[PDB]
Design a protein around this ligand. Structure first.
Ligand code: OLA
Ligand code: OLA
Ligand code: OLA
Ligand code: OLA
Ligand code: OLA
Ligand code: OLA
Ligand code: OLA
Ligand code: OLA
Ligand code: OLA
Ligand code: OLA
Ligand code: OLA
Ligand code: OLA
Ligand code: OLA
Ligand code: LFA
Ligand code: LFA
Ligand code: LFA
Ligand code: LFA
Ligand code: LFA
Ligand code: LFA
Ligand code: LFA
Ligand code: LFA
Ligand code: LFA
Ligand code: LFA
Ligand code: LFA
Ligand code: LFA
Ligand code: LFA
Ligand code: LFA
Lengths: 223, 221, 223
């Protein structure tokens, strides 16, 4: 069932990428870079999850299963998602690449701390986990602080769309560290099968879902 | 023989980099970035192949030359960049198209490394994904990228078409040799595959850049 | 002792990053990118050295201890330091990104050759070491050649500050390959404890120290 679920995930990611390619042919005032980003995220995630379906993207550490392919996925896909968010706030204005790369730096560190925490035992696990959570808090502060102020400077309609997308992303992202802690990698209150379902359903909304809401909103500012 | 051949490869790469450095001192209207790219490719490839000569860049009932993938994951995207920048010579840069090719290429090389580590059907799933990546790269090369070259004048477009065919012809050889050799069906011997992955890169790296840079320098007059 | 020293290092790095964040609030004509770079260097280095303190960032190769976390540190931190140096030479003028990325390329190769040399035995070790030294020589030629000429073109006061920071960095950087050769990774004339102290004290002056001298000099040009 675990294998079948991952095949299904990869196929949905493929259909996501195809949809975003079609949208790109009729760009409606949205730069090609934002369509490229929306295509790479699902394609990369699909390939990583395919490696799990084929039983290559995991190994047995001590007496627990590490799905390391998830981290290979997230270390590319999550920074690209934060880029898409930042570029949404900056739509019709000057780009602030310093703020954008600050988010990329924080995000990559967040994902690495998660991978190391999964490979750690005892107290050490929760030291790394904690550093990742602090990284996520700072990303949220930027998202609702300076980045939201840039969105406001680009007009009411854009700011309203940015706020909607920011809440959508924020809501989904806080679920990842929560699920991680409750599942086998953490306290082990939740079963493997449960965690797998969560890390199949969340990414679908986090990747393909986010980009639909994000791109449709921007295309609507053109009509 | 395998070790000696790899030393010889690294030495030729060094001579290539030195030649491109000399050319850069008299740039003839070609941006410094295109000279830098032409220098990095051979130097990085030389270092990787050196690791094979010293017997570090491989591990073993089949021998995997993993240093090749470390080479290609840096050198091949840089080659596609040089190609893209050739199409865009004198006109506006389209970085979205350029980075699309870098994305496709890096994926192609990773699928190859995973296929080499895979057994049975799984090997050919990964191999297939890499081939599809190469097909799309070729479609971009002869489609949108060629249309940009045409928009920059007949002289530039003619040079671009020549370099595009040159690269395309050499690149299709890599997946073909991979499939026929030990990593695939095993119809060809290890020694044969080694010779191929010595001779092809010399024409793919040092050779491509000579044809590419000389053509662009000629457009100065 | 070795563990405690690494904890102390990480804490000092944290304080360095916090100081540079405060400075950034009153930027005094220094671009935000240069403040971000000064913050990332210590934060990344601190995290890497923390992995050593927890005894994760090292392993036993035959009869020697390899501190591989150092290389994970340097492969990110050293290119960013050369960027800060290059951006100093270019302060008030056009950026030359080709020259900047040439330095990044050389530096990354330098650090990789070092990691491979540490994993090598006999003559092979010193082949890789040699390639890294030649990389460092070319970096020094660029620093005091074309990069210094760019600094001159941006006025006497800037050029004087650049020359001071360039010498400071150059003096500290030549110490790394020297210590490497004399310590366990090389001829083994120096003991592990000695090498550890060197690779605690040097980075503090190389990272937090360099950025203080660099940023204070540039802030002074505002007045
Ligand atoms: C943890 C890994 C960190 C790796 C990422 C390194 C990030 C540091 C780089 C900063 C580049 C700054 C962006 C250039 C500024 C352009 C001007 C602007 O702000 O718009
Ligand atoms: C698949 C492995 C990893 C690949 C990641 C590559 C990153 C893809 C995104 C790049 C963004 C491109 C930015 C282009 C900016 C200029 C846009 C233009 O004017 O055309
Ligand atoms: C050893 C691994 C090396 C990996 C990095 C290689 C980098 C090569 C690419 C260089 C890009 C040059 C950027 C050109 C910008 C033109 C504008 C300017 O020069 O100011
Ligand atoms: C994105 C694409 C890369 C996905 C990464 C997965 C790594 C797969 C490597 C597995 C090797 C085979 C392991 C085994 O058979 O035990
Ligand atoms: C280690 C892995 C790191 C992966 C990082 C992926 C790259 C991240 C961000 C690049 C996106 C920059 C987009 C700039 C577009 C400029 C524009 O269109 O105005
Ligand atoms: C979740 C926390 C978000 C807090 C937002 C802070 C906005 C003001 C600011 O610090 O710029
Ligand atoms: C919405 C809440 C979903 C989580 C509840 C189910 C937990 C099952 C488990 O712990 O194995
Ligand atoms: C390994 C990568 C090494 C490549 C660095 C080459 C140095 C070239 C110096 C001149 C730079 C320029 O083109 O202005
Ligand atoms: C620089 C180019 C990249 C070279 C990297 C590959 C070689 C590194 C592996 C060294 C291991 C030596 C020990 C052994 O395997 O016998
Ligand atoms: C086998 C090689 C396959 C591909 C050849 C190139 C495909 C056709 C070129 C692109 C056509 C176009 O978009 O105008
Ligand atoms: C040019 C074509 C090269 C043909 C070489 C085939 C012989 C190799 C082999 O089967 O071992
Ligand atoms: C972010 C910091 C980057 C450096 C981190 C490296 C730590 C690697 C952890 C490897 C697992 C250690 C196994 C063990 O606990 O014995
Ligand atoms: C060019 C600069 C090269 C500098 C390198 C010098 C190291 C040479 C090897 C040192 C002696 C090795 C003795 C031994 O292996 O026992
Ligand atoms: C690894 C993921 C790579 C996906 C790249 C998708 C390429 C899309 C085509 C580029 C746009 C062409 C414009 C005409
Ligand atoms: C025993 C398990 C304890 C879990 C600790 C998790 C703490 C939450 C993240 C750190 C937040 C720092 C403020
Ligand atoms: C107006 C200032 C910003 C307020 C931010 C509110 C906090 C958002 C948290 C959402 C996460 C779920
Ligand atoms: C011993 C119990 C530890 C307390 C756990 C606190 C509740 C979960 C903390 C993690 C939530 C992640 C989101 C942070 C923003
Ligand atoms: C005969 C051996 C030549 C070695 C040259 C150095 C390696 C290539 C560049 C790195
Ligand atoms: C297994 C050791 C390999 C060290 C070289 C790493 C180079 C990776 C570049 C991508
Ligand atoms: C592992 C991935 C490494 C990718 C190599 C980086 C290639 C990017 C070169 C782009 C150059 C663009 C020049 C614009 C002028
Ligand atoms: C056992 C032999 C399997 C051969 C696989 C060949 C794959 C070719 C992919 C072509 C895709 C278009
Ligand atoms: C995956 C989506 C397919 C991308 C194909 C792009 C080919 C370029 C078309 C140019 C006309
Ligand atoms: C590796 C850790 C990276 C640290 C980046 C720090 C980000 C802070 C950005 C400050 C906000 C600027 C306004
Ligand atoms: C494989 C590891 C590669 C690490 C590369 C680290 C990034 C260094 C380059 C960033 C500096 C660019 C600053 C540009 C300033 C423009 C204003
Ligand atoms: C091994 C890495 C070094 C190889 C260098 C090849 C020759 C290039 C010389 C560049 C000198 C620049 C001076 C301005
Ligand atoms: C045993 C380790 C030796 C490392 C020595 C590093 C190089 C020392 C400095 C020599 C090169 C200076 C170049 C200045 C060029 C000015 C123009
Ligand atoms: C015990 C011997 C310790 C040697 C310390 C050398 C460090 C040099 C730092 C210079 C500033």
């Amino acid at each position: 069932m675990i294998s079948i679920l991952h095949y299904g995930y990869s196929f949905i990611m493929l259909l996501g990428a195809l949809y975003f390619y079609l949208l790109s042919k009729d760009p409606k005032g949205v730069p090609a870079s934002e369509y490229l980003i929306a295509m790479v995220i699902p394609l990369w995630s699909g390939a990583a999850y395919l490696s799990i379906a084929l039983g290559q993207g995991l190994f047995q550490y001590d007496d627990t299963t590490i799905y390391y392919a998830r981290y290979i996925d997230w270390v590319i896909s999550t920074p690209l998602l934060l880029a898409a968010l930042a570029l949404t706030a900056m739509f019709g204005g000057k780009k602030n690449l310093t703020l954008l790369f600050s988010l990329v730096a924080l995000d990559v560190f967040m994902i690495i701390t998660g991978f190391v925490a999964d490979l750690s035992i005892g107290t050490t696990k929760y030291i790394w986990y904690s550093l990742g959570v602090i990284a996520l808090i700072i990303i949220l502060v930027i998202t609702f602080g300076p980045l939201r102020r840039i969105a406001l400077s680009n007009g009411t309609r854009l700011a309203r769309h940015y706020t909607r997308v920011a809440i959508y992303l924020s809501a989904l992202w806080v679920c990842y560290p929560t699920a991680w802690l409750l599942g086998p990698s953490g306290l082990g209150l939740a079963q493997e099968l449960t965690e797998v379902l969560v890390f199949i359903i969340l990414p679908i909304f986090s990747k393909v879902g986010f980009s639909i809401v994000d791109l449709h909103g921007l295309r609507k500012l053109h009509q």
